[PDB]
């Protein structure tokens, strides 16, 4: 930024608020956010398996 001290810095970054995605399964970044049926968003290594393990209907934590 821009201070009286030259060389440091007071400690102040202007950002934007916004919203992250994460796995409720994994609880870490999805790298690619599957949107399902039910609203709520995956991550592949997750969706993947409950694909799988259930072909018929599927269950959401978050719903
Ligand atoms: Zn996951
Ligand atoms: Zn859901």
Same mark, same amino acid.
Do not use: R, W, Y
């Given at each position: 930024?821009?201070?009286?001290?030259?060389?440091?810095?007071?400690?102040?970054?202007?950002?934007?608020?916004?919203?992250?995605?994460?796995?409720?399964? =994994? /609880?870490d970044i999805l790298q690619?956010?599957?949107?399902?049926? #039910? &609203?709520?968003?995956? =991550? /592949?290594?997750?969706?993947?398996?409950?694909?799988?393990?259930? #072909? &018929?209907?599927?269950? =959401?934590?978050?719903?």
């Amino acid at each position: 930024g821009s201070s009286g001290s030259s060389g440091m810095a007071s400690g102040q970054f202007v950002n934007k608020l916004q919203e992250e995605v994460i796995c409720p399964i =994994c /609880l870490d970044i999805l790298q690619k956010p599957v949107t399902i049926d #039910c &609203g709520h968003n995956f =991550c /592949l290594k997750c969706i993947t398996q409950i694909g799988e393990t259930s #072909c &018929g209907f599927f269950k =959401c934590p978050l719903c």
